[PDB]
Design a protein around this ligand. Structure first.
Ligand code: PC1
Ligand code: PC1
Ligand code: PC1
Ligand code: PC1
Ligand code: 3PE
Ligand code: 3PE
Ligand code: 3PE
Ligand code: SF4
Lengths: 98, 171, 83, 72, 115, 67, 155, 318
C-alpha cells in the first residue's frame, strides 16, 4: 500500500506534467485529464479498502460520475473548435488576447 | 507473488507515462484502456472486484467515443506517435530508467519507508475479516440508497443536467 | 371522455411502446402502495442475522428471551413460514 | 387500365380491436415471424441441386456449342 | 493464479497460431498488393482525414449513461438493505430523471443524425 | 434432404457436452469425489483454510473418528 | 523416406486450396449472369466449397466474365495484384478470352490474357453455368497436379 | 490436472465453431433449396479443415500503408477474448466461478470492439474506417441495454454469479417472467456478435469486408474463429439466464445435455435470421434501440425493482 501510492501519486504527477505541456492537440490534453482522474479513483478506493471504510466506498463512483460529465462538456467543445477550424490544434486559438 | 502489485503498479505508472507524452489520441486511448485494466487488477489485488470492473466498464465505453471524435476532429495526415521521432522515445526510455533509478535510490534511504524492496509484499491487506460474511465492496457502493442517499441525488442531477448542458454546447 | 380517451387509441395503434413505458412507469410506483405484502420486504430483510447477535448480561431486568434460544419469548418469526 | 399498388390510407376511426391488431404486430413484430416460418418451409424441401458430373442437367437438340464439320 | 493459467494460454494459442501464419505461407510481397484497396483504383485522398461523424451528440449521451448504468449496478445488493423504501423511491427518482433527460433530447432533436 | 444437417449438429453436439461433463469429473478427481467447493465470501474460505489444517494439506478429507 | 512424405503433403496441401477456393465478386457483362446461375440451386458452388467473397485479400481465384475494356483493365490488374499469390484466374466468355465480339473495337482488350496470366479458359458466349462449373472443376485439378514441395526436395 | 480441463474446454469449442461455419452454410442452403457442402467429407463434415488449412498457407497481407503493430494484435485480441469468455460460463460447475462472473462478460464483451476499431484504423482504407465507425455507433446503441436487460434479470436474482441462476431456475425458466427482456436480449445478443441480419460492419455489399478487407488469410481466420465462437456464448447465456435446464444434482450431465438442446436452437435460430432479413441502414439501429427498447427497458427495469418489494421476492446474497 505504501509502494503503490508513491507510484500512483507519481502517476498523477506525470499526467499533471502532461496536461501542462501540450503537443498541438486539445484532444490529447482532455485525454490526459482522464488518466489523471483514474489515479485518484484507485488511490481513493484502496484507502477505502485497506481501511475497510465501506462508508466511503460510495465516493469512488461519485468522483467518476464527474469524470465523464466533465469529459462530455470537454468533448463537446471540440465540436465547436472543429467547426470553426476543422483541425483541432491548440495553437489556432489565440484571438482573445486582442 | 510478493512482487505482484509493485509490477501492476509500475506497469500503471508506465501506462500513464506514455499517456502523458501525448501521442495521437488513439495510442493515448490505448494507453488508458491498458492502465484502466491494470487499475482493475490492483483495486482487485486489495479486495473489491466491483470497483475495478467499473473503471474497466466506463473507460471502455468512454474511450469508444474517444476513438470516434479523434477520427473526426483530432487526427493528422500522419499520427507520428511513438516510433516516429526521438523526442518522445528518449523521454519514454529515460522516464523508465528514471523510474528504476528513483525507486532504487530511496531504498538506500530506508528511513521514510516510501518503498521497502526487502520488506515488500508483506504489507498489503492489514487484518481484513478472516471469519466473516457480507463484507465485499458493492455493499458500500449500495449505500447510495441507505445512509448515503445524497451522493445519489447529487450525481444523478449531474447527468440530468449534463444531458441539457451538452446540447446547448452543440446547438 | 373522448378528446383524451380516444387520443390514447391511436397512440396505442401507432406509437405502441411509450404507452407501455408510460404505463409501467405509472404502474410501478403505484402497486407497492396498494399491496398487502410490501410490509414484509423491510422485515424478511431485517431478520437475516448476517452479523452475530451479541448477548446482553442479566442484571435483574428485561423479562425477554432467557438464556435459551428455543424459549417462547423474543422475535419468533412464524410469519416467514406460513407466509 | 391502371392499378394503384400503395393506396389505402383512410382514417376509419380505428376501433380498439383494430389497435391491438396493430399494437401486437408491433411489440411482437409478428409480420417477420411470417417470414421465419416462410424460410422454415424450405429447408424441408428437396434441394434442386444435382451432382454435376454424375447428373448433368437437361438440354434440347438445338443446344449449340462446340463446332464440328459433318461428313457424308 | 488459476485464471492466469487459462489466459496466458489463449494469448499463446493466438500468438503461436500467428507465427505459423507469417512464417509458413511462402510470400511474394513486392509493391502493388501491399498498397490500399478502394476497389481497383489508386485512392484519391489519404485514408486518414477527418471523418466528421453525425451521431456526435448520442455518443455523449452514452458517455453520460455508462456512468448511469454503473450507477444502477449496486441494486442487487441494495435490496438487501433493511430500509427498502429509500431504495424504492431513489431507484424511481434515478430512472425517472433519466427518461426525462432522454425525452427532452428525444424532442429537441438530439439523436437524429444532423444533415 | 434436410437430414444431411444432423452430422454438422450431432458432431457439434458431442462437442459442447464435454466442457460441462469434463468440468465436473475433473473436479471430483482433484477434489476427492466432492465438488470444487467454491468460496464467494470470507467465511467459506475460512472453513477451507481450517479444513486444510485438520489433515494433510489437502482439504477434501478427515472428519469424525478422532475425538 | 522423404519423397513419399512430401508427395503426400503436396497432395494434402492442395486438397485445401482446391476444395475451399474462394472466388471473387466480379461481373462486367452478361457472362456474370451465369455465375449467379452457378450460385443458384441447380449447380451449387457452395457444394464444391466455392464461395463468393467480394474482396481480393480474402480471395483465391479471379473469374473474369465480360469484355475487359481499356478503362477497366487497370482496375483488373490493380485487383489481381491485391491477392496473395496462390492466386488463380479463370476467363469466362469469348469476350474475356479473345474479345469475341469487339475483337476489332478500340475500347476492348483482346483477351484477359493480355494483362493477367491465366490458368484456364472457359469458352462460350454465355458459357453454360455447367461450363464454368466444368472449368472450376478443371482448375480444381490443374492444381491437384501442381508439385510445389516435390520440386523443393529436388532442388 | 487443470491444463487437461482447459484442453477439454478450448478444443471442444474451436472444433465446434468450425462446424458452425459448415452448419451456417447448409441450413442457409436448404432454405435456398441448395445443398451445402457434401463432397470434401461425407456431408461436409470435413470442409472447415480445408478452409482452415487453406488460410494458413496464403500470404498474410502486410499492407504498405498500415500500423503493423495493431494490425497483428486485433485478431490476437479478438480470438483471445471471445474464447476467454467461456471460462466462467457455467455448465453446472464452471472452470472459474466468479461472483461478478457476468460483468466479466460485459466488460470483455466490450473489448471485442477494439479488435474491430484498432484493425480498421490501423489498416489504411476508407472501406475499413467505416466498419470501425460502424461498430462505434453500434456499441453505443446496445451497450446501454445489454446491462439493464441483464441487470433487471439479475435484479430478481441476487449476486451476479452465473451459478446462482441454476438455483433460481430450479423449478421454472426465467423466459416466462421476462420475455420482454429476452426479446431485447436476443437482439442485443445480435448487435454484439456483429454477425446479424443487421451486420453493418462486415458489410460485403456496402463496405466490402469492412474492418476486415486489408486482412488476408492468416489473420483473417482469427475473426471468424472469434465471431462464430461468440455466436455460441450469447446463445449459451440465453440457455442459462432465460432457458433454465435441469440441474438435479446426481446426474449433472443432464444440465449439460439439455444445455446442448437449447443452445443449438438459439445457435440455429440465428441462422434463420441471416437467411430471412436485411440490415437497418445504420441510422435505424440507433433509432430502433434508443427510442423503442431503451424506454421499454427502463420501464421493466423499474417494474422488476417494484416486483419483489411489492410482493416479497427478494433474491438472497448467498
Ligand atoms: C416447431 C417449429 C417452431 C416454428 C416456429 C417459427 C415460426 C413459424 C410459425 C408460423 C408463423 O409464421 O406464424 C405467423 C403468425 C403471423 O401471422 P400474420 O402476420 O399474418 O398476422 C398476425 C395477426 N395479427 C396481425 C392480428 C397480429 O404469427 C402469429 O400470429 C403469432 C406468433 C407471433 C409471436 C411470436 C414471436 C414472439 C414471441 C417471443 C417469446 C418467446 C417465444 C418462445 C420461443 C421459444 C424459444 C425460447
Ligand atoms: C482432417 C484433414 C484431412 C484432409 C484430407 C482427407 C482426405 C480428403 C478427401 O477425402 O479427398 C482426398 C482426395 C479425393 O477427393 P478429391 O477432392 O480428389 O475428389 C473428390 C471426387 N469428386 C469431386 C468426384 C466428388 O484424395 C486424394 O487423392 C488426395 C491425396 C492426399 C491426401 C492425403 C493422403 C495421405
Ligand atoms: C487446421 C488448423 C491448423 C492450421 C495449420 C495447418 C497444419 C498443416 C499444414 C501443413 C503444411 C506445411 C507446408 C505448407 C507450406 C506451403 C508453402 C510452400 O509451398 O512452400 C514452398 C517452398 C518451396 O520453395 P522453392 O524452392 O520452390 O522456391 C521458393 C520461391 N519460388 C518458388 C518463387 C522460386 O518451400 C517449401 O517447401 C515449404 C516447406 C515448409 C515446411 C515447414 C514446416
Ligand atoms: C518497463 C517496460 C514497459 C515498456 C516500456 C516502453 C517501451 C515499450 C515499447 C513502446 C514503444 C513502441 C512504439 O513505438 O509503439 C508504436 C508502434 C508503431 O509501429 P507501427 O504499427 O506504426 O508499424 C511499424 C512498421 N515497421 C515495423 C515496419 C516499422 O506500434 C506499437 O507498438 C503499439 C503497441 C504498443 C504496445 C503496448 C500495448 C500492449 C498491448 C495492448 C493489448
Ligand atoms: C525533462 C522533463 C521535462 C519534460 C520533457 C519533455 C520536454 C518538454 O518540455 O515538453 C515539450 C512538449 C511541447 O510540445 P511540442 O510543441 O510538440 O515540442 C516540440 C519541440 N521541438 O510537450 C511534451 O512533450 C509533453 C511533455 C510530457 C512529458 C511526460 C513524461 C515526462 C517523463 C520524463 C521526465 C524527465 C526525466 C528525468 C530524468 C532524470 C535523470 C536521472
Ligand atoms: C400484469 C401487470 C404487469 C405486467 C407488466 C408487463 C407489461 C407487458 C410488457 C409488454 C412488452 C412487449 C414486448 C416488449 C418488446 C417489444 C420491442 C418492440 O417494440 O420492438 C419494436 C421494433 C419496431 O420499432 P419501430 O421503429 O417503431 O418499427 C415500426 C415502424 N413502422 O421492432 C423491431 O424493430 C425488432 C425487429 C428485429 C427482428 C429481429 C428478428 C428476431 C429473431 C427472433 C428469434 C426467435 C426466438 C426468440 C428467442 C427469445 C429469447 C429466448
Ligand atoms: C493481445 C492483447 C491481450 C491483452 C488483453 C487481454 C485481456 C484479457 C481479458 C480481460 C479480463 C477481464 C477483467 C478480469 C477482471 C477479473 C474478474 C474478476 O473480478 O474475478 C477475478 C477473480 C476474483 O474475483 P471473485 O471471484 O469475484 O472474488 C471472490 C473469490 N471467488 O479471480 C482473480 O482474482 C483473478 C484476477 C486476475 C485475472 C486477470 C487476467 C489478466 C491476464 C493477463 C493480461 C495481460 C497479458 C499477459 C502479457 C502478454 C503480453 C501481451
Ligand atoms: S461473351 Fe457473350 S455472354 Fe459473355 S460478355 Fe461477351 S457478349 Fe456477353
Amino acid at each position: 500500500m505504501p509502494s503503490t501510492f508513491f507510484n500512483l501519486t507519481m502517476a498523477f504527477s506525470l499526467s499533471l506534467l502532461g496536461t501542462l505541456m501540450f503537443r498541438s492537440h486539445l484532444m490529447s490534453t482532455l485525454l490526459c485529464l482522464e488518466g489523471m482522474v483514474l489515479s485518484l479513483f484507485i488511490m481513493t478506493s484502496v484507502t477505502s479498502l485497506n481501511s475497510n471504510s465501506m462508508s466511503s466506498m460510495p465516493i469512488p463512483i461519485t468522483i467518476l460520475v464527474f469524470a465523464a460529465c466533465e469529459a462530455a462538456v470537454g468533448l463537446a467543445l471540440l465540436v465547436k473548435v472543429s467547426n470553426t477550424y476543422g483541425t483541432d490544434y491548440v495553437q489556432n486559438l489565440n484571438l482573445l488576447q486582442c | 507473488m510478493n512482487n505482484y502489485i509493485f509490477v501492476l503498479s509500475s506497469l500503471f505508472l508506465v501506462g500513464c507515462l506514455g499517456l502523458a507524452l501525448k501521442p495521437s489520441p488513439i495510442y493515448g486511448g490505448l494507453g488508458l484502456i491498458v492502465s484502466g485494466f491494470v487499475g482493475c487488477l490492483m483495486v482487485l489485488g486489495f479486495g473489491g472486484s466491483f470497483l475495478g470492473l467499473m473503471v474497466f466498464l466506463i473507460y471502455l465505453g468512454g474511450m469508444l467515443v474517444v476513438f470516434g471524435y479523434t477520427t473526426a476532429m483530432a487526427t493528422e495526415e500522419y499520427p507520428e506517435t511513438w516510433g516516429s521521432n526521438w523526442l518522445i522515445l528518449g523521454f519514454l526510455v529515460l522516464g523508465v530508467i528514471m523510474e528504476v533509478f528513483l525507486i532504487c535510490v530511496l531504498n538506500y534511504y530506508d528511513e521514510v519507508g516510501v518503498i521497502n524492496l526487502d520488506g515488500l509484499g508483506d504489507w498489503l491487506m492489514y487484518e481484513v475479516d478472516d471469519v466473516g460474511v457480507m463484507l465485499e465492496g458493492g455493499i458500500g457502493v449500495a449505500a447510495m440508497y441507505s445512509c448515503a442517499t445524497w451522493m445519489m441525488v447529487v450525481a444523478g442531477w449531474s447527468l440530468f443536467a449534463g444531458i441539457f448542458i451538452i446540447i446547448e454546447i452543440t446547438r | 371522455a373522448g378528446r383524451i380517451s380516444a387520443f390514447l387509441k391511436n397512440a396505442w395503434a401507432k406509437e405502441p411502446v411509450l404507452v407501455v413505458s408510460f404505463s409501467v412507469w405509472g404502474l410501478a410506483i403505484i402497486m407497492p402502495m396498494i399491496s398487502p405484502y410490501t410490509k414484509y420486504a423491510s422485515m424478511i430483510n431485517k431478520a437475516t442475522p448476517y452479523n452475530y447477535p451479541v448477548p446482553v448480561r442479566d442484571d435483574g431486568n428485561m423479562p425477554d428471551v432467557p438464556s435459551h434460544p428455543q424459549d417462547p419469548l423474543g422475535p419468533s418469526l412464524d410469519w416467514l413460514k406460513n407466509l | 387500365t391502371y392499378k394503384y399498388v400503395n393506396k389505402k390510407e383512410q382514417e376509419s376511426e380505428v376501433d380498439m380491436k383494430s389497435a391491438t391488431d396493430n399494437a401486437a404486430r408491433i411489440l411482437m413484430w409478428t409480420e417477420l415471424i411470417r417470414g421465419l416460418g416462410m424460410t422454415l418451409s424450405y429447408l424441408f424441401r428437396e434441394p434442386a441441386t444435382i451432382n454435376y458430373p454424375f447428373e448433368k442437367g437437361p438440354l434440347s437438340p438445338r443446344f449449340r456449342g462446340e463446332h464440328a464439320l459433318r461428313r457424308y | 493464479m488459476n485464471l492466469y493459467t487459462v489466459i496466458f494460454i489463449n494469448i499463446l494459442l493466438s500468438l503461436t497460431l500467428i507465427l505459423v501464419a507469417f512464417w509458413l505461407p511462402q510470400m511474394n510481397l513486392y509493391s502493388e498488393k501491399a498498397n490500399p484497396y478502394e476497389c481497383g483504383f489508386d485512392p484519391t485522398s489519404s485514408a486518414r482525414l477527418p471523418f466528421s461523424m453525425k451521431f456526435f451528440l448520442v455518443a455523449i449521451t452514452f458517455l453520460l449513461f455508462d456512468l448511469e448504468i454503473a450507477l444502477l449496478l449496486p441494486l442487487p445488493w441494495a435490496i438487501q438493505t433493511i430500509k427498502t423504501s429509500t431504495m424504492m423511491i431513489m431507484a424511481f427518482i434515478l430512472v425517472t430523471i433519466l427518461s426525462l433527460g432522454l425525452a427532452y433530447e428525444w424532442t429537441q432533436k438530439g439523436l437524429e443524425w444532423t444533415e | 434432404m434436410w437430414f444431411e444437417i444432423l452430422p454438422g449438429l450431432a458432431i457439434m453436439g458431442v462437442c459442447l457436452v464435454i466442457p460441462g461433463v469434463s468440468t465436473a469429473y475433473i473436479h471430483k478427481f482433484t477434489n476427492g469425489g466432492k465438488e470444487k467447493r467454491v468460496a464467494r465470501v470470507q467465511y467459506q474460505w475460512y472453513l477451507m483454510e481450517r479444513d486444510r489444517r485438520i489433515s494433510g494439506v489437502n482439504r477434501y478429507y478427515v472428519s469424525k473418528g478422532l475425538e | 523416406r522423404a519423397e513419399y512424405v512430401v508427395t503426400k503433403l503436396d497432395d494434402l496441401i492442395n486438397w485445401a486450396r482446391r476444395s475451399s477456393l474462394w472466388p471473387m465478386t466480379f461481373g462486367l457483362a452478361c457472362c456474370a449472369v451465369e455465375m449467379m446461375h452457378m450460385a443458384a440451386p441447380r449447380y451449387d458452388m457452395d457444394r464444391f466449397g466455392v464461395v463468393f467473397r467480394a474482396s481480393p485479400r480474402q480471395a483465391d481465384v479471379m473469374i473474369v466474365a465480360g469484355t475487359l475494356t481499356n478503362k477497366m483493365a487497370p482496375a483488373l490488374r490493380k485487383v489481381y495484384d491485391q491477392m496473395p499469390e496462390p492466386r488463380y484466374v479463370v476467363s469466362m466468355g469469348s469476350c474475356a478470352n479473345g474479345g469475341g465480339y469487339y475483337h476489332y473495337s478500340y475500347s476492348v482488350v483482346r483477351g484477359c490474357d493480355r494483362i493477367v496470366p491465366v490458368d484456364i479458359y472457359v469458352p462460350g458466349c454465355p458459357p453454360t453455368a455447367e461450363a464454368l462449373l466444368y472449368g472450376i472443376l478443371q482448375l480444381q485439378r490443374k492444381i491437384k497436379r501442381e508439385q510445389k514441395l516435390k520440386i523443393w526436395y529436388r532442388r | 490436472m487443470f491444463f487437461i480441463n482447459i484442453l477439454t474446454l478450448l478444443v471442444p469449442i474451436l472444433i465446434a465453431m468450425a462446424f458452425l461455419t459448415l452448419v451456417e452454410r447448409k441450413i442457409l442452403g436448404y432454405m435456398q433449396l441448395r445443398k451445402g457442402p457434401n463432397i470434401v467429407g461425407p456431408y461436409g463434415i470435413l470442409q472447415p479443415f480445408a478452409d482452415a488449412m487453406k488460410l494458413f498457407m496464403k500470404e498474410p497481407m502486410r499492407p504498405l500503408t498500415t500500423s503493423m503493430s495493431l494490425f497483428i494484435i486485433a485478431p490476437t485480441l479478438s480470438l483471445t477474448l471471445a474464447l476467454s469468455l467461456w471460462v466462467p460460463l457455467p455448465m453446472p460447475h464452471p472452470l472459474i466461478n466468479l461472483n461478478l462472473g457476468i460483468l466479466f462478460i460485459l466488460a470483455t464483451s466490450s473489448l471485442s470492439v477494439y479488435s474491430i476499431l484498432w484493425s480498421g484504423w490501423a489498416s489504411n482504407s476508407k472501406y475499413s474506417l467505416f466498419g470501425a465507425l460502424r461498430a462505434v455507433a453500434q456499441t453505443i446503441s446496445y451497450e446501454v441495454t445489454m446491462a439493464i436487460i441483464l441487470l433487471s434479470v439479475l435484479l430478481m436474482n441476487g449476486s451476479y454469479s452465473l451459478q446462482t441462476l441454476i438455483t433460481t431456475q430450479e423449478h421454472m425458466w426465467l423466459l416466462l417472467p421476462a420475455w420482454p427482456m429476452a426479446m431485447m436480449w436476443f437482439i442485443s445478443t445480435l448487435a454484439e456478435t456483429n454477425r446479424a441480419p443487421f451486420d453493418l460492419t462486415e458489410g460485403e455489399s456496402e463496405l466490402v469486408s469492412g474492418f476486415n478487407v486489408e486482412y488476408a488469410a492468416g489473420p483473417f481466420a482469427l475473426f471468424f474463429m472469434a465471431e462464430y465462437t461468440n455466436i455460441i456464448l450469447m446463445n449459451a447465456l440465453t440457455t442459462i439466464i432465460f432457458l433454465g435446464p435441469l440441474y438435479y444434482i446426481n446426474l449433472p450431465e443432464l444440465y449439460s445435455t439439455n444445455f446442448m438442446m437449447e443452445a443449438l436452437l438459439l445457435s440455429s435460430t440465428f441462422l434463420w435470421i441471416r437467411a430471412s432479413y436485411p440490415r437497418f441502414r445504420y441510422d435505424q439501429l440507433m433509432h430502433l434501440l434508443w427510442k423503442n427498447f431503451l424506454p421499454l427497458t427502463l420501464a421493466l427495469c423499474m417494474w422488476h425493482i417494484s416486483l419483489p418489494i411489492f410482493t416479497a421476492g427478494v433474491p438472497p446474497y448467498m
